[PDB]
Design a protein around this ligand. Structure first.
Ligand SMILES: *[C@@H]1O[C@H](CO)[C@@H](O[C@@H]2O[C@H](CO)[C@@H](O)[C@H](O)[C@H]2NC(C)=O)[C@H](O)[C@H]1NC(C)=O
Ligand SMILES: *[C@@H]1O[C@H](CO)[C@@H](O[C@@H]2O[C@H](CO)[C@@H](O)[C@H](O)[C@H]2NC(C)=O)[C@H](O)[C@H]1NC(C)=O
Ligand SMILES: *[C@@H]1O[C@H](CO)[C@@H](O[C@@H]2O[C@H](CO)[C@@H](O)[C@H](O)[C@H]2NC(C)=O)[C@H](O)[C@H]1NC(C)=O
Ligand SMILES: *[C@@H]1O[C@H](CO)[C@@H](O)[C@H](O)[C@H]1NC(C)=O
Ligand SMILES: *[C@@H]1O[C@H](CO)[C@@H](O)[C@H](O)[C@H]1NC(C)=O
Ligand SMILES: *[C@@H]1O[C@H](CO)[C@@H](O)[C@H](O)[C@H]1NC(C)=O
Ligand SMILES: *[C@@H]1O[C@H](CO)[C@@H](O)[C@H](O)[C@H]1NC(C)=O
Ligand SMILES: *[C@@H]1O[C@H](CO)[C@@H](O)[C@H](O)[C@H]1NC(C)=O
Ligand SMILES: *[C@@H]1O[C@H](CO)[C@@H](O)[C@H](O)[C@H]1NC(C)=O
Ligand SMILES: *[C@@H]1O[C@H](CO)[C@@H](O)[C@H](O)[C@H]1NC(C)=O
Ligand SMILES: *[C@@H]1O[C@H](CO)[C@@H](O)[C@H](O)[C@H]1NC(C)=O
Ligand SMILES: *[C@@H]1O[C@H](CO)[C@@H](O)[C@H](O)[C@H]1NC(C)=O
Lengths: 49, 50, 420, 460, 50
């Protein structure tokens, strides 16, 4: 979805170097402040909040 | 010498499974190859921070 | 003035018939000063020296018509290739009349070849018409020979474009093998029962043995074969109720050649209306100057529409084949050949006979055996797929919700880990 | 072993260099009794072909057969295919109608052409378009055969493409042109690059129709294969001067070097089969007096020399027998009515002489054309954003436009390479919306004289 | 309005330079000014041009 949106290439080029296999990797990383943001559906994120 | 899929789509298109029942992302690319169903969940995208 | 006409292996009931067709071609075609001159040769089983003898006899003859007249040949090669390939040096049109391989229809290769015995791709067209009769979507394909089989698969994918349907399974392999049972099991695991068979006679006998020993002729199964599978040892080993196809007056020879010679004669006498008439040179001893009106004479032969004859309306298509031929639909009723249908090129008509199937009733087998147990795959989603190890052995913890409701768990087979 | 090279030709080539072609060659000669026979012929009728094939097979059982041709009859090679169906002998084709590409061989045939398949030619043409990134194009085919494979390979190539080509749908010709249905089929093409697959007799009618439709413009490009582009000298007058074609007919590598390479591959297969099996000479006894029950061998070089290594060139073969990596030449028609050589094709990748693509803008005489623009700019960050090409895709990101930068070696030199580089920014978007509105063509590059502009003693 | 350049003919259909003017139209609506004797030839050419 970001690869088609070429006007959002730069963030894509910022995010291509840190991609994670599973979402729980990103969850454990953002809980221990190894990240700063994540792009996800609203209902699941509010559920986990 | 071919762009190919993997994961759930790689195991579905190979016929290893029968039907994906999962939070599968409806987009333009996947429906060019397979069919979809009508969605049970409507939701957008947002940012999780600390 | 004089036109030579070449025939190869005119049979002993056709050695007079060929000269009779030469005489009838000069009968009603006007008082013009053109004459004809018949040249008939007979093979010996080496195609090299016979290709040489035929090609220099045609160079010394300077023919305008080249024919193929070999039904009673037990040689399994069935290659009239080198005479057509020699005539392609001058683009001289060769009218085959016996073979049914689509590999002869390669106009990239066979530059100057036409024939009136259309191949098994048209049997696939008949099969698509039968699909439109029975309103079927999922079919099972099985072809051994690869040269005709790629053409058959391509023709079938061209046929499926109308509904935008797709074949359920593709099967292409080495002909002659005796170990195909794994692909038959993977076809059995599929939903449909539509069997499409296009192979050699030994391969058809092999799959008949692998079918009859493995219950594949019972109820629900849909058998559908052609003409190679109803001949020879495949005809010996065929189970009953099987449905094949047959060319009406295809293997018939004398009236076939008579209608072909009438087509050639009226096409030539139409071509003599046009000017710039070239002639084949003496290409035996060093004459490589190609014949000028090759594609012109071929293009005159392409749109040669006819309705007179014994078989009836004969006309060449974009493949240069018999438009809208007659077809028989044969059944093996208790090891006996019973015709159960007829096919004009646009519709199917069943006869007064009953369609007896290898399984149960005479109705169409609704062979779409549904997947009653669906193999469901999913990914580990945290709010959606909660995953627990087994408590003691294959058991869970039967918990309730906050409102008194047991959470309906399931025995999954999830990934043990995510590391490769 | 007994290896013969025959040439039925008219081009004046002597024979003694072909006798020298074995002596210093094959320095690591693992087969001992290798005997070469070089023969030159004049007329290419099939009688002499069959006769001398039987003479050479009776001539001490020759296993290596190499033939090239100067004439343009492809079916002769097909004739050799029938010879390849009978002699059970691996035969190499070199040049001309012996080297023209056929569709599908036989398992009974062992003849090997030296050329490129139509899929490989399509790969080279789409590699040209990939190197030029002209995304808006169309496919035009006829009922000339070998066409559904062509269209299908193009469809699978676009579906497996790095670019994501915005390909307009395929318009196919059906009959001889009525100029009523066919004209409506041709009016749907407002693109700039047209791919044409037809015969040479059909191409004259098609380009005459496009000239009558005005579809032979300076913006309208034409890339045709070697199958339609025939003789290099015989060119009809109805072709645009700038007609892009690709053919492996090279003259920097002549016929003698290529038959030397074929002899190297033959001796390589012979030495490797000698390392595998002892009794190498296995052929047919005689043509005349042929009794039946042929002793079909199982020690052949047909499915044995699939790969080969010679002179650093990976000259491996495909499943049908075609070369994996041949040597293709990209040419165009010049204003001097000759097929001007432009570039060469590598093993897989592609390199051209003119990096900046020349137009040959006077494709005919009735072309008053002045709608190209030469545009220069300087790097200013909120307007001009200059980056390298993406090395992963060898393609700029599609929102950007390419330019060239005359990057020099040093201060003492005066030569520079025009490095094609990606550009976005504000004025790039201005230029794109102008080219959508004013509907012009343009050429973007950078200033290498220096800064914006300043009068230095009445010199700007 | 969006107007293509006005096509003016010389004589009846020549198949040399008249169709050069005719084939430049990829639009839909065309008005015509001729005589009834010229109209048959113009509509026959437009049928032949499709
Ligand atoms: C067609 O004309 C040829 C002569 O050009 C005839 O063929 C000859 O027939 C006689 C008698 O059988 C033979 O002795 C010659 O050897 C033949 N010459 C050949 C092969 O050209 C032939 O009779 C004519 N057509 C018929 C009636 O078959
Ligand atoms: C044909 O191929 C199959 C393998 O596909 C082999 O036979 C079967 O092999 C499976 C294991 O793959 C066994 O479970 C079966 O018991 C075998 N069946 C029989 C009867 O052999 C073997 O290579 C060939 N055998 C046939 C004719 O099925
Ligand atoms: C094949 O062709 C025809 C028609 O099927 C049949 O034989 C001819 O039959 C017609 C009447 O339909 C007669 O006028 C002819 O005299 C018959 N010819 C001969 C020689 O039998 C028969 O079915 C087959 N005959 C062959 C082998 O040609
Ligand atoms: C199917 O074949 C198997 C082979 O073991 C045989 O046991 C069985 O009887 C057959 N099916 C039926 C229902 O007859
Ligand atoms: C044959 O073609 C040539 C081409 O110039 C022509 O001059 C000649 O009149 C043609 N022959 C006839 C009788 O049409
Ligand atoms: C099937 O046979 C009839 C016999 O007259 C023949 O006209 C035609 O080839 C086929 N069907 C029709 C009537 O078109
Ligand atoms: C065959 O005959 C005619 C054409 O002659 C055709 O209209 C008709 O539909 C066909 N009928 C059959 C037997 O399918
Ligand atoms: C052409 O070759 C033949 C042998 O095939 C030979 O007899 C003849 O003299 C040659 N003609 C010339 C001189 O080119
Ligand atoms: C060609 O491929 C084979 C494997 O099929 C390999 O063993 C061989 O080294 C390769 N090259 C040569 C030297 O033939
Ligand atoms: C092609 O040739 C080059 C130069 O010899 C070589 O480095 C490369 O490995 C070869 N492979 C490709 C890219 O086809
Ligand atoms: C020449 O050399 C360096 C490196 O090639 C180059 O960057 C520069 O343009 C020149 N430097 C000077 C001013 O000598
Ligand atoms: C570089 O070239 C310029 C002239 O373009 C000159 O003024 C300058 O002195 C040169 N620098 C060096 C490397 O001497």
């Amino acid at each position: 979805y970001f690869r088609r949106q070429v006007e959002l290439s730069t963030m894509y080029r910022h995010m291509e170097k840190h991609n994670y296999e599973s979402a729980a990797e990103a969850i454990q990383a953002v809980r221990d402040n190894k990240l700063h943001a994540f792009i996800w559906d609203s209902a699941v994120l509010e559920f986990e909040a | 010498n071919k762009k190919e899929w993997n994961g759930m789509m790689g195991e579905l298109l190979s016929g290893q499974a029968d039907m994906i029942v999962a939070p599968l992302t409806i987009n333009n690319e996947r429906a060019q190859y397979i069919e979809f169903s009508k969605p049970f969940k409507y939701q957008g995208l947002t940012i999780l921070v600390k | 003035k004089i036109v030579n006409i070449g025939a190869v292996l005119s049979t002993r009931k056709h050695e007079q018939m060929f000269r009779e067709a030469v005489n009838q071609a000069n009968k009603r075609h006007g008082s013009w000063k053109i004459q004809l001159n018949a040249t008939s040769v007979t093979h010996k089983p080496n195609a090299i020296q016979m290709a040489l003898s035929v090609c220099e006899d045609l160079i010394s003859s300077q023919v305008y018509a080249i024919l193929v007249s070999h039904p009673p040949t037990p040689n399994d090669h069935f290659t009239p290739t080198p005479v057509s390939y020699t005539a392609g040096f001058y683009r001289i049109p060769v009218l085959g009349l016996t073979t049914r391989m689509s590999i002869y229809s390669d106009k990239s290769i066979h530059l100057s070849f036409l024939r009136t015995v259309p191949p098994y791709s048209h049997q696939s067209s008949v099969w698509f018409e039968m699909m439109r009769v029975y309103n079927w979507n999922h079919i099972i394909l099985l072809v051994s020979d690869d040269h005709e089989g790629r053409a058959a698969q391509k023709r079938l994918e061209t046929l499926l474009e109308e509904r935008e349907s797709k074949a359920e399974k593709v099967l292409q392999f080495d002909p002659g093998t005796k170990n195909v049972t794994a692909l038959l099991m993977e076809a059995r695991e599929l939903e449909a029962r539509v069997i499409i068979l296009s192979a050699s006679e030994d391969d058809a006998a092999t799959v008949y043995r692998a079918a009859a020993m493995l219950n594949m002729t019972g109820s629900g199964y849909v058998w559908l074969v052609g003409e190679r599978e109803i001949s020879g040892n495949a005809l010996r080993y065929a189970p009953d109720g099987i449905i094949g196809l047959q060319l009406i007056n295809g293997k018939n020879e004398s009236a076939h050649i008579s209608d072909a010679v009438g087509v050639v004669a009226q096409a030539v006498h139409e071509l003599l209306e046009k000017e710039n008439i070239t002639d084949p040179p003496r290409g035996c001893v060093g004459n490589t100057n190609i014949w000028k009106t090759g594609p012109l004479f071929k293009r005159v032969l392409m749109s040669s529409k006819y309705a007179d004859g014994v078989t009836g309306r004969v006309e060449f298509n974009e493949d240069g084949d018999r438009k809208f031929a007659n077809y028989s639909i044969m059944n093996l009723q208790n090891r006996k050949l019973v015709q159960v249908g007829i096919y004009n090129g646009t519709h199917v008509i069943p006869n007064d006979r009953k369609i007896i199937w290898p399984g149960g009733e005479t109705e169409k087998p609704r062979g779409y055996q549904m997947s009653t147990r669906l193999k469901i795959v999913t990914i580990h989603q945290e709010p959606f797929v909660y995953v627990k190890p087994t408590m003691s052995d294959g058991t869970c913890k039967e918990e309730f919700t906050v409102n008194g409701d047991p959470v309906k768990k399931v025995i999954c087979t999830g990934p043990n880990d995510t590391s490769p | 072993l007994n290896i013969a090279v025959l040439l039925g030709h008219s081009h004046d080539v002597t024979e003694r260099e072909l006798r020298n072609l074995w002596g210093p060659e094959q320095a690591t000669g693992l087969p001992l009794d290798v005997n070469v026979v070089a023969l030159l012929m004049n007329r290419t009728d099939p009688k002499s072909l069959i006769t001398h094939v039987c003479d050479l097979m009776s001539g001490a059982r020759i296993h290596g057969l190499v033939f090239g041709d100067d004439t343009d009859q492809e079916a002769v090679a097909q004739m050799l295919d029938f010879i390849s169906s009978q002699t059970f002998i691996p035969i190499l084709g070199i040049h001309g109608g012996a080297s023209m590409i056929m569709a599908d061989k036989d398992p009974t045939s062992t003849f090997f052409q030296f050329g490129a398949s139509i899929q490989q030619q399509a790969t080279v043409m789409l590699k040209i378009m990939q190197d030029y990134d002209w995304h808006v194009f169309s496919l035009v085919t006829t009922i000339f055969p070998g066409y559904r494979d062509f269209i299908s390979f193009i469809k699978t190539t676009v579906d497996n493409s790095f670019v994501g080509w915005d390909m307009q749908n395929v318009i196919t010709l059906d009959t001889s042109f009525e100029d009523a249905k066919t004209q409506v089929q041709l009016k749907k093409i407002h693109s700039s690059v047209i791919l044409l697959y037809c015969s040479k007799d059909e191409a004259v009618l098609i380009l005459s129709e496009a000239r009558s439709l005005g579809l032979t413009g300076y913006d309208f490009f034409w890339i045709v294969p070697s199958l339609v582009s025939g003789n290099t000298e015989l060119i009809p007058k109805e072709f645009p001067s700038g007609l892009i074609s690709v053919s492996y007919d090279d003259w920097d590598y002549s016929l003698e070097a290529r038959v030397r390479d074929g002899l190297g591959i033959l001796t390589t297969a012979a030495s490797s089969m000698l390392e595998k099996f002892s009794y190498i000479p296995e052929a047919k006894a005689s043509c005349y007096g042929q009794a039946e029950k042929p002793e079909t061998p199982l020690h052949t070089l047909h499915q044995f020399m699939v790969n080969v290594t010679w002179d650093g060139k990976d000259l491996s073969f495909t499943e049908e027998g075609y070369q994996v990596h041949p040597r293709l030449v990209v040419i165009v028609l010049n204003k001097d009515r000759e097929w001007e050589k432009v570039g060469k094709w590598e093993n897989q990748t592609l390199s051209l002489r003119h990096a900046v693509w020349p137009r040959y803008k006077s494709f005919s005489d009735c072309e008053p054309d002045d709608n190209h623009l030469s545009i220069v700019t300087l790097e200013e960050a909120p307007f001009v954003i200059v980056e390298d090409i993406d090395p992963l895709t060898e393609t700029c990101v599609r929102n950007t436009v390419p330019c060239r930068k005359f990057v020099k070696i040093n201060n003492s030199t005066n030569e520079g390479m025009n490095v094609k580089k990606c550009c976005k920014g504000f004025c790039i978007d201005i230029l794109k919306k102008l080219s959508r509105t004013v509907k012009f063509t343009y050429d973007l590059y950078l200033v290498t004289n220096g800064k914006h502009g300043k009068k230095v003693n009445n010199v700007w």
